[model samples]
Target: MNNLKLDIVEQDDKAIVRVQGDIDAYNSSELKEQLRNFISTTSKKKIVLDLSSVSYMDSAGLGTLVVILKDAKINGKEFILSSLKESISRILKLTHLDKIFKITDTVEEA
Candidate 1:
């Protein structure tokens, strides 16, 4: 079953957006709104969206991330992605969006 939960872990340098479960059309919009609101409201200058826990993601999910990326950009902040699955990273690369982002091997590095 596909379910989505978004969480946050704050650190001295950045805030980590902890995500778990599959991201699909059913929950993509919800996620987009949550992230959009969080980006605007959070005081952290940098946010790392931890995707290592996500098991799957559809096109809607991918689109949701892009929207959030733009959301962060316009808000004057950084939205990094951590530990992306090979499949997910491939899709981003396919769309040429990968180069536009900052990715790391671990949440600590992002």
Candidate 2:
């Protein structure tokens, strides 16, 4: 079984969604829901997905991320990702999505 955890942090100017553990088929839609709701409701223009502790992610997770990125772009918001693990980074590169997202080494940089 996969253990996934999600937490949202809202600051004055930005919102960060921290995710941990594996993002597989079991929780990808739920993750999408949480992210979409935040994206839709937040007044903040900057959103950062803190992915430091996320050990794994599948195609579903990737799809969800793409959707979020597109929506943020359409809304003229700043969407970024931080602290990606090596495997996940490789996967994104393999899928040619690395060029599409703004990734930072830390949340502070995002």
Candidate 3:
């Protein structure tokens, strides 16, 4: 079983989702569903993902993030990915996905 945890905090027109543990093929769908539901139900203008505590992510996890980013764009909202682990940052940079997503060093900055 995938061992991932999420904590979400909402503010005016914005929300911060703190992810803990690995986001892999086994759990990526859960993350995607949570994020999608939050956006659709709350109509949040901004969503920030705090990934500092995330240990690892597979291709499926990265794909889910891309889909979320596109959905936010389509909804005219802002999606930010913050506090990535070095490995995560390296993968993003290598894939050039870093350019496609707004990334920050901290959630507060997002």
Q: What TM-scores do the predictions have?
A: 0.87, 0.87, 0.88
lDDT of 3 by residue, 21-98 (tens): 778875578888877777776556778899988787788888988888776766677888889999888888888888
Runs in model 1 deviating more than 4 A are: none
Tens digits of per-residue lDDT, candidate 1, 3-55, equal 68788877786888878777788657887887898888878868888888767
lDDT tens digits by residue: candidate 2, 1-110? 44776778886788887787777775578777877777887778789888888888888788888888877776667888889998898888889888887788887787
State candidate 2's TM-score. Answer: 0.87
lDDT of 3 at 6: 74
lDDT of each: 0.80, 0.80, 0.80
Q: Of models 1 and 2, which has the larger TM-score?
A: 2
Model 3 steric clash pairs: none
Find the 10 residues in a row with the least total lDDT in model 2.
Answer: 1-10
Q: List residue ranges in candidate 3 displaced over 4 A.
A: none
True-vs-predicted CA distance for residue 101, candidate 1, Å: 2.2
